[PDB]
Symmetry: D2
């Protein structure tokens, strides 16, 4: 946890399939873990240009960079040096389903991400396959302890050309490679996220993304 | 329209429905401060009590006029008067239970009148809802966005269980105004932070008092665009 | 108790999205041959602003031909009768729940059904009335919790070709105690539900169903 | 197209992926009678064995060329050769497990070659899959229908459980031919009856032999139209 500095660098490898299209990506970036901000510069290195909106891959590119406010125990930062994993299913309301699994490790002071993606049943005439998307709205995730890890739930809204949205729901399981005796678990909490596309080029084979993420309790008054 | 909604408002409600195959009716009366986003409801199970399922699965079906819209967010619900509005929802529990609910909201002699219809099916007969192992809801954030001249809402809610766990459910809501579109200023995407709390119960949950605070906001995180 | 010929009467009420409605019907069929006809009237809320097809499956489990000696949970439930509850999820977001009570009063089968559908998209084929009835389907039934559960996918034909798929999950509960019921194991019902006649923007509808229960007759290595 | 698929065919397969963060690899070989709908596959877990999860969840990912198409139903799979075809699938278990799979089917020197990738998530640790308390699959009927120059399939499958009862799952499949649509005669709606059986196993499911029979038909029920 004192392994995680005020500025940290990251590198990533990603591969998988969406429908029948194979691809690979790599990225590099940096952020301030305690401030909850980060930047990633991404290259589609195989299978580009993608025949699907890049927005569906956006959330798969970094949990160490969440500002855990209010003394909330930090499952992610606490996991180092052992590191951690995550597994997710994202279900779009028009049929697309994307699962993703991820390994996070720390090697010579650099965070190293290895991601796998498997997307299926995206409608060939819907807005993902037809590239009619304009990035994600901000969202709140709820995290709660479950099976010795953390589970997360959120709904995210994918902006469409013309002003509408396509909604998706995701369910994540976060697992620490640190033995449970050395981790103090949080209770229920919330993470507010704003994931933004900063730059793109060459039919989204180059993308720059930024994320700000701040964890908190619910601050509403309680009658109890 | 907004002028019809005063600083202090009373409510009256009728509910009937089924869960699994158990029929029930409820009645309630309450009061709140619509602009401050707080309300209290005192609820009676008048038929089919004691219910064989956790009253918690009905708790979110008992009041959208009572949201504090911060930051100038246009208020779809308050703007709807005097015509009023309706809502429809499906709540899906991760162990199989599915609860649909439809609701009519009207203003009648300065009283808010709720008529609610519930149909819940396929709760597991040996799960925590049917065996009454629940302890109320965690706080939650709902996302609301415009769709089809109305609003839709999405949230995930966590139902606390005896022993420390949670059972998660997801709900998808459509809110429809009875006011003609040309007379509504529509909001964009926004968020509502909610805390629904049970304050009293008696007689195997045939008498229940609930309180809700709801506060609407934009996302306050800084943006790079 | 359940004779070779049987008549039926039904009341239905409910809501889809925000549209309230009521229907009634009568028909007859042959419970042992798995066939039945129902003539159906929309008596309040007509004409419906949604495709009647979404209601078709809610209008009769006593009329399934249970072959090969499969213990027939439905027919054994008399005179006490039985209920069912269902959720149908459409792949474009419509969700319809339905609960039903089936009783036998003075030789006639009596049905009381309640419908609540939500979230049907206003541009989709259901709310546009651009559907052309159901394909045939096979339902899987299996014992669970002292009742039976059913699983099927159904394909709703669309004006202009293609289909909209839905999935349903059904729970069938007997009003007769467990100890006076022989339970089946896993089995399958083949169904063909067709519309014979409509009139007056679907406010009158005639429907026929044939339903036959069977085991799987593929050969087994075990 | 169909001329390349003989009365007897051989298959080889490679599989890899992950279920709840356990990585694994499998190989298989086998043979069958494509036009009679029968086939046998002998499978080795070559990396990650013994698996911490019921092998039953992988069984449906190990061969669409082996469907007996009765009644003149145009056979999308056999017509796709020599180019071959792919499939993609999501299987949703009623206790939360989700398994996505994608497959490449090709024909090389008269051998069918299968390349399969598997990604399973959220299988509950005290459920039957992760506790390895399953006893194979019931028979099932799949519905197939054309959609967008492809074929989609829908089915519910019942997984037999140690102690009696079943865990139910649903799957949604998309089959895509590599052959241009120009050269394919598409079927309409039809049905496939399946019976997938475990014939033998050894060494804690690191060796498994499976058989499948699959027969396509229309519905034989009389029609009133």
């Amino acid at each position: 946890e004192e392994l995680i500095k005020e500025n940290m660098h990251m590198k990533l490898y990603m591969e998988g399939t969406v429908n029948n299209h194979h691809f690979k990506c790599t990225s590099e970036g940096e952020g301030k873990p305690y401030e909850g901000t980060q930047t990633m510069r991404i290259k589609v290195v195989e299978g580009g240009p993608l025949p699907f909106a890049f927005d569906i891959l956006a959330t798969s590119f970094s949990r160490t960079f969440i500002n855990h406010t209010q003394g909330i125990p930090d499952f992610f930062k606490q996991s180092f040096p052992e590191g951690f994993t995550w597994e997710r299913v994202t279900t779009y309301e028009d049929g697309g389903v994307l699962t993703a699994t991820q390994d996070t490790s720390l090697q010579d002071g650099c965070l190293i991400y290895n991601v796998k993606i498997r997307g299926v049943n995206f409608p060939s005439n819907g807005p993902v396959m037809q590239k009619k998307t304009l990035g994600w709205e901000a969202n709140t995730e709820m995290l709660y302890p479950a099976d010795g890890g953390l589970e997360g739930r959120t709904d995210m809204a994918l902006k469409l050309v013309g002003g509408g949205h396509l909604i998706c729901n995701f369910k994540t399981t976060y697992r620490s490679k640190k033995p449970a005796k050395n981790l103090k678990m949080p209770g229920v909490y919330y993470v507010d996220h704003r994931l933004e596309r900063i730059k793109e080029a060459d039919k989204e084979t180059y993308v720059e993304q930024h994320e700000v993420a701040v964890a908190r309790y619910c601050d509403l008054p309680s009658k109890l």
